[PDB]
Amino acid sequence: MLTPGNPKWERTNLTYRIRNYTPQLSEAEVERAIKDAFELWSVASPLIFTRISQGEADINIAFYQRDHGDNSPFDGPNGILAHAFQPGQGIGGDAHFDAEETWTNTSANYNLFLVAAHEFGHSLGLAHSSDPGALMYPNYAFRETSNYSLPQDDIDGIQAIYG
Numbered sequence: 001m002l003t004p005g006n007p008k009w010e011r012t013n014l015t016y017r018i019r020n021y022t023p024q025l026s027e028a029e030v031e032r033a034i035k036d037a038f039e040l041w042s043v044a045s046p047l048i049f050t051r052i053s054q055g056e057a058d059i060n061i062a063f064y065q066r067d068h069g070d071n072s073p074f075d076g077p078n079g080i081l082a083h084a085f086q087p088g089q090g091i092g093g094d095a096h097f098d099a100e101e102t103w104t105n106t107s108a109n110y111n112l113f114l115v116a117a118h119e120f121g122h123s124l125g126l127a128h129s130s131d132p133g134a135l136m137y138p139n140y141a142f143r144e145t146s147n148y149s150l151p152q153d154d155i156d157g158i159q160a161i162y163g
């Protein structure tokens with residue numbers, strides 16, 4: 001449930017920065033998807049996320065294709081959708097999304113908000129969950145719903161780390 005090793009952030013106010021974008025959505029839709037994804041975790045913990053557009057943020061977000069400098073290359077359409085690093089300095093906490101994927105703000109593959117929410121859990125220190133209905137479950141599966149709040153299993157996960 002919680003990223004192994006137990007490494008976590010030691011502050012409650014963290015900064016993030018969107019370094020580049022995706023041509024499939026407007027820059028505003030991208031920024032909104034990120035903001036809402038961080039909000040899911042913020043309402044269930046003491047964590048407060050603030051955006052900056054310059055300087056070294058704690059959490060860097062970016063869209064890359066195949067090899068992109070961290071020895072973990074993406075694989076083209078479908079398959080790996082994105083990945084993120086556990087809390088720490090430097091590349092720690094950063095999240096990358098595969099630029100070759102179709103990104104949407106709809107139920108069509110693949111919803112940026114949903115993938116981002118999942119990736120940020122890793123950025124915060126959570127590991128994969130066995131609960132098929134959890135945000136942190138290993139495989140992506142968009143679920144049509146009206147309640148846009150964190151599943152109880154993910155709430156337990158974050159509270160276990162940050163209270």
Ligand SMILES: NC(=O)C[C@@H]1CCCc2sc3nc(C(=O)NCc4ccc5c(c4)NC(=O)CO5)[nH]c(=O)c3c21
Nearest residue numbers: 081115118134135137138139140141142143145148149
């Ligand atoms: N309908 C929505 O806008 C999302 C829905 C309501 C808001 C809260 C949550 S948490 C969640 N979780 C899932 C889901 O498939 N979780 C497992 C998962 C999600 C995203 C992923 C992965 C796994 N694995 C990856 O490698 C990439 O990103 N599906 C949802 O629809 C969902 C929702």
Ligand SMILES: [Ca+2]
Nearest residue numbers: 058090091092
């Ligand atoms: Ca970082």
Ligand SMILES: [Ca+2]
Nearest residue numbers: 076078080098
């Ligand atoms: Ca891919």
Ligand SMILES: [Zn+2]
Nearest residue numbers: 068070072096
């Ligand atoms: Zn990467």
Ligand SMILES: [Zn+2]
Nearest residue numbers: 118122128138
């Ligand atoms: Zn994951």
